Amino acid sequence: ASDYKDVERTLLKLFKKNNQVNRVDLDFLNLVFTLNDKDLTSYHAEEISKLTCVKNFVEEVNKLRETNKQLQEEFGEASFLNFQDANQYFKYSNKQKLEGTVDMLNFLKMVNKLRCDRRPIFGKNLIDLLTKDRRVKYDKSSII
Amino acid sequence: SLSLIAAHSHITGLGLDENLQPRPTSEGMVGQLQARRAAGVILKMVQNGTIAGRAVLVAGPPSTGKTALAMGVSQSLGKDVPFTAIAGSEIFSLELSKTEALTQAFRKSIGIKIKEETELIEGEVVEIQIDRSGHKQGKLTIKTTDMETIYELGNKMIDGLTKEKVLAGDVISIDKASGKITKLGRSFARSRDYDAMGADTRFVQCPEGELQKRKTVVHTVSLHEIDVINSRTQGFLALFTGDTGEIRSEVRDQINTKVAEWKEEGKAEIVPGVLFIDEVHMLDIECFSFINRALEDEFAPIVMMATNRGVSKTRGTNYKSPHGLPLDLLDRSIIITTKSYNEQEIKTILSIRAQEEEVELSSDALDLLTKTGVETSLRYSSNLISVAQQIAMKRKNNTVEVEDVKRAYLLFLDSARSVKYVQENESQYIDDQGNVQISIA
Amino acid sequence: SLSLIAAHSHITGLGLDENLQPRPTSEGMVGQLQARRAAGVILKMVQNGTIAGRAVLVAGPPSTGKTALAMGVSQSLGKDVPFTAIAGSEIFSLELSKTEALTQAFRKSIGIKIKEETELIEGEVVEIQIDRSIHKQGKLTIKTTDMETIYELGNKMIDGLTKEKVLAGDVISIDKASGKITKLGRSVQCPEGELQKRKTVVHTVSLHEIDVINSRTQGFLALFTGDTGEIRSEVRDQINTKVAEWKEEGKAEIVPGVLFIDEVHMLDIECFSFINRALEDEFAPIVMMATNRGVSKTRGTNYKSPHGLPLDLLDRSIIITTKSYNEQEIKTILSIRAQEEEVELSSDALDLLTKTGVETSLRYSSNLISVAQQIAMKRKNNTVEVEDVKRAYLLFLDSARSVKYVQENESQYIDDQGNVQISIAK
Amino acid sequence: TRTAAHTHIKGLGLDESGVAKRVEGGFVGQIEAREACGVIVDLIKAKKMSGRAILLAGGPSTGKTALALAISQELGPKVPFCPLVGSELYSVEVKKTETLMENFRRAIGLRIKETKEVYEGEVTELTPEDAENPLGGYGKTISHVIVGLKSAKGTKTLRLDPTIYESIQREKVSIGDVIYIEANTGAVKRVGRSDAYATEFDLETEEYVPLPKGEVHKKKEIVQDVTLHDLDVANARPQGGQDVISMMGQLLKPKKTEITEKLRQEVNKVVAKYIDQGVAELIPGVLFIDEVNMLDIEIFTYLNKALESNIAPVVVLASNRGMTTVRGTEDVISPHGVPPDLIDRLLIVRTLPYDKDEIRTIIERRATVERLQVESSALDLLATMGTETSLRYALQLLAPCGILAQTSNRKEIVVNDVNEAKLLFLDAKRSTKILE
Amino acid sequence: TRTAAHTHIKGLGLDESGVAKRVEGGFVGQIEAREACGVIVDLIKAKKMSGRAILLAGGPSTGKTALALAISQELGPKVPFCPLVGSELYSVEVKKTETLMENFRRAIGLRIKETKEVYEGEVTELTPEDAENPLGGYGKTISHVIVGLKSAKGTKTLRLDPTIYESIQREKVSIGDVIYIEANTGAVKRVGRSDAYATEFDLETEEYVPLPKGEVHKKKEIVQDVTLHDLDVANARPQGGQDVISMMGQLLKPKKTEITEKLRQEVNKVVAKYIDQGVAELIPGVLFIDEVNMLDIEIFTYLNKALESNIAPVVVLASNRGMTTVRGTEDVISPHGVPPDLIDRLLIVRTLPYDKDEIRTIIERRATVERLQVESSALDLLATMGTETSLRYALQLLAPCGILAQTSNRKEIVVNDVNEAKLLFLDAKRSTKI
Ligand SMILES: Nc1ncnc2c1ncn2[C@@H]1O[C@H](COP(=O)(O)OP(=O)(O)OP(O)(O)=S)[C@@H](O)[C@H]1O
Ligand SMILES: Nc1ncnc2c1ncn2[C@@H]1O[C@H](COP(=O)(O)OP(=O)(O)O)[C@@H](O)[C@H]1O
Ligand SMILES: Nc1ncnc2c1ncn2[C@@H]1O[C@H](COP(=O)(O)OP(=O)(O)O)[C@@H](O)[C@H]1O
Ligand SMILES: Nc1ncnc2c1ncn2[C@@H]1O[C@H](COP(=O)(O)OP(=O)(O)O)[C@@H](O)[C@H]1O
Ligand SMILES: [Mg+2]
Ligand SMILES: [Mg+2]
Ligand SMILES: [Mg+2]
Ligand SMILES: [Mg+2]
C-alpha cells in the first residue's frame, strides 16, 4: 500500500478542485444539527434565539441610509467621471464608503441570524437530567 | 410540515359531533358511519388515558378507508399525543430481533412530559475588577434593561471567569446551583470593531426584566428515547443513527422504575399514544406471540391494526387463520369493520380529491369518473383525475371534460384490462416456467 | 513475476493473422478455429473501445477450451488494459451484497489513465552544508555526467533532507513540487544528463479504485484489505461525472476492458437481473461468460433454462460455441503440454497418451505426463517410455474406472442413505 | 465516443400539443406509450403531487427502459432520477426497507442557495496588537490583528478577530503566501505561495500559485442541488470533530444504518423553514425500479406505506412478465408479478411489440449512431433475422459485422459479412438446438 | 390510574394452614391451580432447591398469566422475578443458548447487608497535638489530629490518628465544610459548605448543603440488591475512562457477547466467599417463560442441560397448546409444545375453564377495578356474551360501553350501551362470518 500513496494523492488533488468550488456549507445553514446536543442547552438556545439583534442592524442601516440620502441631496447629480476637484472626489469616496458599510451591516445581520438560530434537538441539560443516577450518592454506596 | 398533495392529504380528522355521531361528510371523510363511530370511541378511550394495552383490528375490503380511518384518528389526536405508524415489514431487521423492534415501537408510542426547574442570572457584564496576590477576590457588575447589581466573586467563581475569558459587553448566563458560566454572546456595540468575525462570536441584545429568574420547562421524551440515552454513553446519537442495538432488559426495567418515581413525585406525566401497524398480516407467529404479552403492561399503548386478508395463511405457520392472525391475538382484540361504498359516496370522495388537487371537474366528467370507479376501482379514478387534468392543460383548456377523461382512460390501463391483455398474449410475456417468445415472425 | 507451471501457461495468445484468421497451431493454441475467430472479433471490439455493454457467452462441453480461450484473449489483449477474471462463487460474500460485488467487479474492468507531469532533479550528491539560524541557511551540490552546481535550499527542503538524512556520494532524486526524496545507491548506474528533467508519469487506475479512494478518509487501504463495503451510489455518480469531465478536458483517458465470469451457472436470478441493466449503461465493460451445462435450473429459480441463464440475459448475449477435439488435436495439445513441462516423451509414449486421452479425457492424459516423468526418474531414465506411462495408468485411476470400482463394490462405500459395511466378514 | 444501448434515445419526441411523431427523438413507434410518458413528464414538472406511481408493462425488448431514460432526458439534469433494479434492494448492511426509503429520499432534490463573502489575496503584513492596558485582558492579552492582502486590482488592510489570528497561526501563513478567508465561517485556508517569490530559492517545496484575480473582497452567490438523503447522511455521520475518537470513527467503514424517522422529520422541518424563507426550492425527482419482479412481498407491502407519504417521488416500475407468482409468496399469482394491492395504486402503461418496418428503422438508426455504413440488402437481411429471433440479437450483431467488414478493408457491411457473423456468433435458440 | 390486564390480581388469596378461598385477591375459581402455586411459592421461599420446573397447562383465558403474576406478587418485590416470552430468545447479536443463560442468571439474586459507622458534621476545629519524638532529631511531631464536628442537636471532638492529614489534604477541606469520614477506613469526603456561610459571598460555584441532622456519630445499614447477570456484565465490561480500551469501546458499539464460563465461575467464587463472610444472602427467584411453544428444539435441549445446574432458578412455563409438533422438528408431536424429555423433568398444573357465575363475578370485579358502574341486567347480558364468545371479549368490551355511557351523560352502563358496543365492535367469530 506504500506504492499506492502517489496514486491516492493524485486522485485527491484531481477531485478537490471540483469539490471545493460549488459547495454549500450545510453546517453554516444549520442543516447539520446532531453535534448541537453535545455543547448546547435547550433554554440557552431558545434565549439566544429570542435575544437576536436584528432590530439594531436594521435601525443602523436605516440611519446610515438616511444620512446617505441627505448627502446625495446635498451633492446633487452623482457621477463616476474622472475627478478634477477635491470636494467632488471626497464626497464620492464618502458615498462609496457608506454604501460599503451598509452592505457590511446587512451581511453581518444575516450571518448573526443564521448563527443564533442554532438549536439542539435534546439539550445537554436534558441528557444530564435523563442520565442522572436518581438521588444516589456515595453516602449509601456499597463498598463491597 | 414539508408536504405535497398525497393520498390522505384531505383528512383533517373524523367528522364526529359532540355525541360521537358522525356527520355525513366532515373534516374530509365521507360515509363509514359505523366505522367512524367505533374509531371515535377508540379515540376517546385514548384521550381518557386510563385504559392500557388494547388491541384494535381494522378489517374490510381493500380501498375501504382503513388507512383513511387511521389517518383521521391521528389527526384528531393531534400533537402532544404520540402516534407511531409503521408497516408490517418494517420490524424485520438485520440488527434488531423482531421482539426488540416491537419493543422499541411500543416504547415510541408512550411519551413522558418531564419538568426541569432552572434558576439563572443573565445580563451584560459592564465592569469586572479582580484583585489577586493568597486567594483572589473581585467584584463584578451585571446589568439588564431595567436593573443593575454588583456581585462579589469567590475564588472558584474567579477561576471560572478566567477560564471562560469573559470581557465587558458579553452577555452571560450563570446557574446559581453549580456556578457554571455560559457565554450567550456579545453586545451590538462591539460589532463595528472587526471586519471578519470568528465562528464563535454572536451579537445579542441585553436581557430584559429581573436579573435572577425562575422558570420551568416541559420536555416531551418517549420511553424509547430515555432507554437509548441511558443505554450507552452517547445514546442520543443512536436516537438519530439508529445503531442502538438490542437494549438491555435491565435498562428498560430501570427506566420503568425511574419513570414511576418521577410520576409519583409529580415531575413527569404519562401521555399514552397509539401504535398503528399497517398490514399486520406480514408479521410472524413469533411477533404475534410477543404482542399478546406486550399489551398486558401498565405502560403498553393502544395498538391499531389494519388487515384486508380473509382466511389466509399466517406467516411462520402452516395453517390458515380467520384474518391471517392467530386466534389468541384475535381473542384480545376488538374489531372495527369497513363497508364498501355506493355510487354517491364515491362521487363525494372524487369531488373532495379534485378539490384537494385544485382540479376543476365538470359534472359529466365527474359522472364518468364515478362510473369508472364503481366499475373498476376508486383509486383508479382518483389517480386518473390528475392525469386528466394534465391532458386538459396540454389542450390549453383550464377545465377538464369528458374527452380528457376518455383519453386518460385510453392511455392508462387498470388491473382488469391489463389482465385481459396479458392473458390474450401469454406467449410474449415471461411465465412462471420462464418461457417467453421474444421472436415475432 | 516468478511462478510455477499452471495448466494454461502455454497459451501465450490467440494465434491470429492480420485477417483475424487463426492458424492451425500458433501462440500455444490448437484448433478451435471458429471459436478463435469469434474471440478475435471480440478482441478487436475491446481494442476499438467504441462499443460498450456487450456480453459474450462461451458455451460448450467440458475440456474444450473455454478457459483456454479466455486466457488467450487476455494475453493477446496484453497489459495496459483491465481484465478481471472472477469465478461465479466469489460474488457470495458476507460483507457485500451480490449486486454490490457485481458492481465492483464491473468497475474494476474499466481503466482510467491519468498523466502527471513532475519536475524532479536527479544526480549524484557531492556536498551538503546546513547551518543554524543566523531560519536556516543551506547549500547542496549535485553532480552529474556534465554539470556540477550548488543549490540554495529553503526551510522545508532542509527539513526534508534532514528527515531523510541523505549522505554524500549517493544518487538522490528530489521532486520540486511534491518534495518527495527517493534514495539510490552510489553511482552500474550513473547520472545521464541535465540536472532538472521534465518526464511525465502515467497512473493506471480503475473506476472502482477511485470509488474506494473517495469512499473514506483512507479508503485506498481497502483495495488490499478488502473491507470496502457497499459504496454510496452518489459517490459513484460523482466519479462518473468527473470522469466524463476529465475525458472532455483531455487530462485523462478511459481504457475499457474485459470482465470474465468463469462459472456463471452459479449466480442466482438476482445477479442476472442486475447484469441485464448493468450492461446497458455507459462505462459497462465487455462481459465474457463461460458455461458448460446444456439445460439446467437457474439458481434461485425452480425452472429450467437454455444454459442455466434466464432468457432475458441470453437475448442480450452472443454465443460462441466450442467443439470437442479429435485425435490429432489431442496429440498436438499433449505435445505442447509436455514441452511446457520440460518432459521428453517418446513417439510410442505420445501415441499411448493420445489414445488414453481420446478414450477417457484430455485432462487425465495431461496430468499423467508429470507422474510418468517422475516414474522414469526413479529408473534413472531421461526420456519417458511406454512402460512408465503404463505404470502411471496402473497407479492412478480416472473417473470411469473409479466409478466402475465403486459400482462393483458399492457395499464398502458410504451411500446416499448413509449405509456401509465396514466389516470385511459377512 | 462510446455507444451504449440507449445512446440514440435523446427524448420522447412529442409535439407542443402532446402528440407523438412517428419517428423523432430516436424513437420509432410506441405512440401511445410515448404520449403517456409525456403526460407523466408534465405531471412531474407540475411539482404538486407525491407518491404517484406508474408501471411500464410489456414483453422483453419492447422499450420500457428506453421510455424511462427518455423521461429522464426530458426532465433534464437538474431533476433527480435514481435508477434501480429489484436486486439492488437486498443489501447485507441494513434491512431492505431502509434501502428502499433511502432511495426514495435520494430522488427528492433540493436547490439551496447561500451568499458567501471571501477575502482572498497575498499576505503583505501581519501586525498583531496588544491591548492599550495590560489589565484589559487575560494572559497574552492579544487584541485585533492587522492583515494586508494584495489582489490583481489592489490591496486592502483588514482588521481581524484574535480567533482569525489563531487560525492564521494554525495554517502556518507567512508574508507572501496566498490565503483565503471565509467571512461566513471564519475559516482560513492557505492556497499556496505567490508566483512573485517563485525564484527566491532555487530548490524549495512550495506549491506556487498565481495572485487571485478580481478584488480582494468578492461576494458570490453559491447555488447547489442536494437531495434530502444527502442531508440525512450528513446528520447521521457528521464529519466534524478533531478528537482522537472523531478521527478513529472517520477511519471506520461507513456501514449503512437505519436512520430513524425522527431525523427525517427534523430534516423536513428545517427544509420547510428554508423553503418558506425562499432560501431553498424543492425538486421532486423520479425513482426508476427496473425488474420489479425481483422484489419480495415485504418490499411491496412497505411500498404501499411509502407511496402514501407527504414527500414521495414518482416511482416508475418496469415488469416484463405476466401471471407470475410473487416472490416471497407461495400461492398469490399476480398480473405482472406485482401484488394486487400495489397494482391498485398504479397506472399501467402498456407497451406493444414491433413489426418488421419498425425493427428495420431501429436497425437503421442504430447503425447510423454507431458510425457504421450498412447496405440495403444486408439491412433487410438483418431485419428478417431480427423478426426471426429478436431485435436485440440483430442490434448486437451489428458491431461484429462492422469488425468483419473492416478486416476485409470494406467501408460498409455486406450481406456476406452478416452471414459470417451469424456463423461465428449464435443465438439462444440455435445454441439450445446445438446443445440438444 | 392506569389499568392493565392484571391490575386486580393482588395475590393467590390463600389462608395459613388452609386452602384457596373462593374469591379473594382478585381470583375467582381455580382452586387447585392456586393451591399448587401456593406450594410452589413455599418451595421458592424455602430457597433450598434449584432447577425446579412447573408448567401452566390450559386453554386460552384460563388464568395462566394471572397465576404467574400472583406467584410474583406473593413472593414480593424482593425476590427477582423475570417475565419473558419464548419469542424473545431469538436474538440477532448472540446465540439462543447465551440468551437463555443470561435470563437464568438474571433470575438469581443477591442481597448485601453492610453496616457502616460514620462521623458527619461541619468542621469547626483542626489542631494537631505535638508529642515527644521516639527518634528525637529535634523535629516537630504530631501524635493526633483533632477535628471538631457540629451537627443538629450534637457536636463532638475527635482525636483521630495522624494519618488523617493525607485525606484532609486530598479532599481540600476547610473550616465550615461538612465532611464524611468512615470510622474504620480513615478516608474523608466533603459534600459541600455549610448553609450558614451561604451569605458570606454573593456568588460562589460550590454547592452549599444543609447541615446534617442527628448526632455526629451515625450507624447506618445499607442494603443493595444485585443479580448474577449484573455482576457478570459488570465484570465483562471495561471500567470506562481515558484508557485506550475504553476509547475503542466508545468507538465500537457494545454488542452482546458469549460470556465465558471462566468469568461466571469467578463471579460464583467471589459471591460464595462473601456469603460465607456473612455479608450476602442468595435469593433463587423465578424465571417465567410464557408461550413456551415458541421455543425451538435447541433451546429445549439447553433447558434440559441447564435445569441440572447446581445454581438455577424456578422456571415457570405456560402453554395453551394440545398435541402440536415441536418447533424445529418434523415429526415430534408432544403434549403441549414441550418435547417429552423436558416434560419428564417438570410438574404440570391444570387451569380449568369457567362457568357462567365465575365469568359474571370476574366481569363485575374488573368493572369495579376500572371505576365503572353497571346495572344488573347489563351485567347478565355481558356474562351471556362472555359465555357465548369469550371472557376477554367482554372484559375488553367493558371500556367502550363506559365511553358510550359517558357520551350519553350517564354515569351507569345500561343494556342499550352494551348492545351499541356489540354492534360497533365485532368479535372474532362474527368477523370471520363477515
Ligand atoms: N381466576 C381468575 N380470576 C380473575 N380474573 C381472572 C382469572 N383468570 C383469568 N383472569 C383474567 O382474565 C384475563 C385473561 O386471562 P389471562 O390469564 O391473562 O390469559 P391466559 O388465561 O393466560 O390465556 P393466554 O395463555 O394468555 S392466551 C386477564 O385479565 C386475567 O386477569
Ligand atoms: N370514508 C372516506 N372518506 C374520505 N376518503 C376516503 C374514505 N374512505 C377512503 N377514502 C380515500 O380512499 C383512498 C383509499 O385509501 P384506503 O381506503 O385507506 O385504502 P386501504 O383501505 O385499501 O388501505 C384514500 O386516499 C382515502 O383518502
Ligand atoms: N485450443 C487449445 N489449445 C491449447 N490447449 C488447450 C486448448 N483447449 C484446451 N486446452 C488445454 O486443456 C486444459 C483444460 O482446458 P479448460 O480451459 O479447462 O477447458 P474447460 O474450461 O472448457 O474445461 C487446459 O490446461 C488447456 O491448456
Ligand atoms: N421505440 C423504440 N425506438 C427505437 N429503439 C428502441 C425502441 N424501443 C426499444 N428500442 C431499443 O431496443 C433495445 C431494448 O430496449 P429496452 O427498453 O432496454 O428493453 P426492455 O423494453 O425489454 O427493457 C434498446 O437498446 C433500445 O435502444
Ligand atoms: Mg392501507
Ligand atoms: Mg473452465
Ligand atoms: Mg430493459
Ligand atoms: Mg398468557
E11 Cβ closer than 6 Å to some ligand 1 atom: no
Backbone angles phi, psi at E120, to 5 degrees: -135, 140
Backbone angles phi, psi at B322, to 5 degrees: -55, -40
Listed in sequence order, the residues at least 6 apart from D258 whose beta carbon sits closer than 8 Å to its beta carbon are: B93, B95, B242, B243, D94, D95, D98
Instruction: Give the position of cell 479425457.
Output: C361
For the record, the C-alpha cell of E135 comes out as 527518634
Exposure letters B148-181 (e unless 16+ CB within 10 A, then b): eeebebbbebbebbeeeebeebbbbbbbeeebeb
Domain containing residue C399 = 327-406
Shortest distance, CA A8 to any CA of chain C (angstroms)? 7
- Please choose from E3, E22, E62 the residue to mutate so as to test ligand 1's pocket, defined by most ligand atoms within 8 A of CB: E62
Can chain C be said to touch chain E, i.e. do they have 3 or more Cβ pairs within 8 angstroms? no
User: DSSP letter at C91?
Assistant: S
E28 Cβ closer than 6 Å to some ligand 1 atom: yes
Of E29, E101, E61, E84, give the one whose Cα is nearest residue E316. Answer: E84
Of B168, B183, B180, give the one whose Cα is nearest residue B129. Answer: B168
Residues of chain D positioned with their CB less than 8 A from the CB of E245: none
Residues of chain D positioned with their CB less than 8 A from the CB of C37: 424
CA distance B406 to B385: 11
CA distance C219 to C228: 7
For the record, the C-alpha cell of C409 comes out as 463394490
Helix (H, G, I), strand (E, B) or coil at E3: strand
Can chain B be said to touch chain D, i.e. do they have 3 or more Cβ pairs within 8 angstroms? yes
**8 A C-beta contact, residue D375 and residue D58:** no
Binding residue positions of C: 60-67
Residues of chain D positioned with their CB less than 8 A from the CB of C279: 5
Taking residue C243's Cβ as centre, other Cβ atoms within 10 Å add up to 19
- Helix (H) / strand (E) element for C172: namely strand C170-175
Listed in sequence order, the residues at least 6 apart from E64 whose beta carbon sits closer than 8 Å to its beta carbon are: E56, E58, E290, E318, E320, E351
End-to-end Cα distance, chain C: 59
Q: Which atom of ligand 1 is nearest to the CA of E67?
A: 17
Shortest distance, CA B202 to any CA of chain A (angstroms)? 6
Q: How far is the CA of C291 from the centre of ligand 6 (A)?
A: 8
Binding residue positions of B for ATP: 60-67
Across the A:C interface, residue pairs with CB atoms under 8 Å apart total 33
Q: How far is the CA of B32 from the centre of ligand 1 (A)?
A: 34
CA distance C140 to C363: 65
Helix (H, G, I), strand (E, B) or coil at E44: helix
For the record, the C-alpha cell of B43 comes out as 379515540
Judged by a CB distance cut-off of 8 A, whether residue A56 touches chain B is yes
Q: Number of C-alpha atoms within 13 angstroms, CB side, residue C68?
A: 23
User: DSSP letter at E211?
Assistant: P
Burial of E252 (0-12, 13-18, 19+ CB in 10 A): exposed
Taking residue E320's Cβ as centre, other Cβ atoms within 10 Å add up to 22
Burial of A14 (0-12, 13-18, 19+ CB in 10 A): middle
User: DSSP letter at D312?
Assistant: -
Cα Rg, chain A, nearest whole Å: 28
**8 A C-beta contact, residue E51 and residue E309:** yes
Of C93, A24, B170, C217, give the one whose Cα is nearest residue D248. Answer: C217
Report the residue from D161, D263, D298 with minimal CB separation from B201.
Answer: D161
Q: Hey, of C280, C305, C307, C313, which one would you mutate to test binding to chain D, going by the most D CBs within 10 A of its CB?
A: C280
**8 A C-beta contact, residue B337 and residue E431:** yes
Judged by a CB distance cut-off of 8 A, whether residue B133 touches chain C is no
Question: What is the CATH classification number for the domain harbouring C333?
Answer: 1.10.8.60
CA distance D109 to D283: 5
- Give chain B as a 3 state SS string: CCCCECCCCCCCCCCECCCCCECCEECCEECCHHHHHHHHHHHHHHHHCCECCCEEEEECCCCCCHHHHHHHHHHHHCCCCCEEEEEHHHHCCCCCCHHHHHHHHHHHCEEEEEEEEEEEEEEEEEEEEEECCCCCEEEEEEEECCEEEEEEECHHHHHHHHHHCCCCCEEEEEECCCCCEEEEEECHHHHHHCCECCCCCCEECCCCCCCEEEEEEEEEEEHHHHHHHHHCCCHHHHHHHCCCCCCCHHHHHHHHHHHHHHHHHCCEEEEECEEEEECHHHCEHHHHHHHHHHCCCCCCCEEEEEECCCCEECECCCCEECCCCCHHHHHCEEEEECCCCCHHHHHHHHHHHHHHCCCCCCHHHHHHHHHHHHHCCHHHHHHHHHHHHHHHHHCCCCCCCHHHHHHHHHHCECHHHHHHHHHHCHHHCECCCCCCCCCCC
**8 A C-beta contact, residue B143 and residue B126:** yes
Listed in sequence order, the residues at least 6 apart from E137 whose beta carbon sits closer than 8 Å to its beta carbon are: none
> What separation in angstroms does the CA of D411 have from each of A109, C18, D366, D373?
70, 17, 17, 7
For the record, the C-alpha cell of E34 comes out as 392456586
Listed in sequence order, the residues at least 6 apart from B83 whose beta carbon sits closer than 8 Å to its beta carbon are: B73, B74, B77, B109, B273, B274, B276
Resolution of the solved structure (Å): 3.3
Of E175, E179, E180, E170, give the one whose Cα is nearest residue E200. Answer: E175
For the record, the C-alpha cell of C2 comes out as 516468478
Question: What is the CATH classification number for the domain harbouring C132?
Answer: 2.40.50.360
Residues of chain A positioned with their CB less than 8 A from the CB of C114: 10-11, 14
CA distance D142 to D160: 12
Judged by a CB distance cut-off of 8 A, whether residue E106 touches chain B is yes
CA distance E386 to E390: 5
Can chain A be said to touch chain B, i.e. do they have 3 or more Cβ pairs within 8 angstroms? yes
Residues of chain D positioned with their CB less than 8 A from the CB of E251: 245, 248-249, 252
CA distance E157 to B148: 46
Judged by a CB distance cut-off of 8 A, whether residue C342 touches chain B is no
Q: How far is the CA of B291 from the centre of ligand 2 (A)?
A: 27
> What separation in angstroms does the CA of D230 have from each of C170, C226, D239, D313, D345?
53, 26, 13, 16, 28
End-to-end Cα distance, chain E: 37
CA distance E300 to C130: 80
Q: Number of C-alpha atoms within 13 angstroms, CB side, residue B353?
A: 25
- Read out DSSP for D120-133? EEEEEEEEEEE-SS
Report the residue from A37, A104, A134 with minimal CB separation from B258.
Answer: A134
CA distance E247 to C328: 71
CA distance C307 to C321: 12
- Please choose from C67, C353, C367 the residue to mutate so as to test ligand 3's pocket, defined by most ligand atoms within 8 A of CB: C67
B68 Cβ closer than 6 Å to some ligand 2 atom: yes
CA distance D3 to D7: 6
For the record, the C-alpha cell of D367 comes out as 447503425
User: DSSP letter at C287?
Assistant: E
Of B356, B275, B365, give the one whose Cα is nearest residue B29. Answer: B356
Report the residue from D117, D234, D240 with minimal CB separation from A107.
Answer: D117
Judged by a CB distance cut-off of 8 A, whether residue E404 touches chain B is yes
Cα torsion for E32, E34, E35, E37, to the nearest 10°? 120
Of D332, D56, D294, D287, give the one whose Cα is nearest residue B418. Answer: D56
Give the technique used to solve this structure.
cryo-EM
Report the residue from D86, D205, D403 with minimal CB separation from C41.
Answer: D403
Shortest distance, CA B50 to any CA of chain D (angstroms)? 27
> What separation in angstroms does the CA of C79 have from each of C199, C255, C258?
22, 11, 12
Q: How far is the CA of E61 from the centre of ligand 1 (A)?
A: 5
CA distance D23 to D31: 9
CA distance D234 to D254: 12
Report the residue from B197, B217, B239 with minimal CB separation from A43.
Answer: B217
End-to-end Cα distance, chain B: 56
Hey, which chains touch B, using 3+ CB pairs under 8 Å?
A, C, D, E
| Kind of pairing between the strands at C170-175 and D81-85 | unpaired
CA distance C50 to C74: 19
CA distance C124 to C172: 6
Helices and strands per DSSP (H, E), number in chain A:
6, 0
- Helix (H) / strand (E) element for D432: namely helix D428-435
Q: How far is the CA of C77 from the centre of ligand 3 (A)?
A: 19
Q: Where are the beta strands (DSSP E) in C218-266?
A: 252-256, 258-261
Report the residue from C298, C304, C311 with minimal CB separation from B436.
Answer: C311
Nearest chain E residue to B253 by CA: give it.
E82
CA distance B171 to A52: 12
E5 Cβ closer than 6 Å to some ligand 1 atom: yes
Of B144, B111, B138, give the one whose Cα is nearest residue B126. Answer: B144
Amino acid at C417: Q
User: DSSP letter at D295?
Assistant: S
Taking residue A66's Cβ as centre, other Cβ atoms within 10 Å add up to 10
Report the residue from D162, D268, D308 with minimal CB separation from B8.
Answer: D308
Record: contact D2-C38, CB cut-off 8 A: no
For the record, the C-alpha cell of E432 comes out as 370471520
Alpha helices, DSSP H, located in D12-63: 31-46
CA distance C53 to A107: 52
The CB-based long-range contact list for B25-28 (8 Å cut-off, 24+ gap) reads B25/B348, B25/B352, B27/B72, B27/B75, B28/B72, B28/B352
Cα Rg, chain E, nearest whole Å: 31
Residues of chain A positioned with their CB less than 8 A from the CB of C223: 1, 4
Q: How far is the CA of E10 from the centre of ligand 1 (A)?
A: 13
For residue D203, the cross-strand partners are C153
Shortest distance, CA C220 to any CA of chain A (angstroms)? 7
Shortest distance, CA E265 to any CA of chain B (angstroms)? 22
Residues of chain B positioned with their CB less than 8 A from the CB of A53: 188, 203-205
- Helix (H) / strand (E) element for E88: namely none
CA distance B225 to D383: 66
Burial of E331 (0-12, 13-18, 19+ CB in 10 A): exposed
- Read out DSSP for D160-207? E-HHHHHHHHHTT--TTEEEEEETTTTEEEEEEEEGGGTTSSSB----
Cα torsion for E188, E192, E197, E203, to the nearest 10°? 140
**8 A C-beta contact, residue B25 and residue B15:** yes
D361 Cβ closer than 6 Å to some ligand 4 atom: no
Record: contact D39-B90, CB cut-off 8 A: no
Across the C:D interface, residue pairs with CB atoms under 8 Å apart total 198
Listed in sequence order, the residues at least 6 apart from B224 whose beta carbon sits closer than 8 Å to its beta carbon are: B104, B107, B108
**8 A C-beta contact, residue C413 and residue C420:** yes
Exposure letters C269-298 (e unless 16+ CB within 10 A, then b): bbbbbbbbbbbbbbbbbbbbbbbbebeeeb
Judged by a CB distance cut-off of 8 A, whether residue C218 touches chain D is yes
Cα torsion for C275, C276, C282, C287, to the nearest 10°? 50
Q: For C34, left (φ over 0), alpha (ψ -120 to 50), or beta?
A: alpha
Of B160, B165, B182, give the one whose Cα is nearest residue B173. Answer: B182
Burial of C382 (0-12, 13-18, 19+ CB in 10 A): exposed
- Please choose from C5, C8, C23, C75 the residue to mutate so as to test ligand 3's pocket, defined by most ligand atoms within 8 A of CB: C8
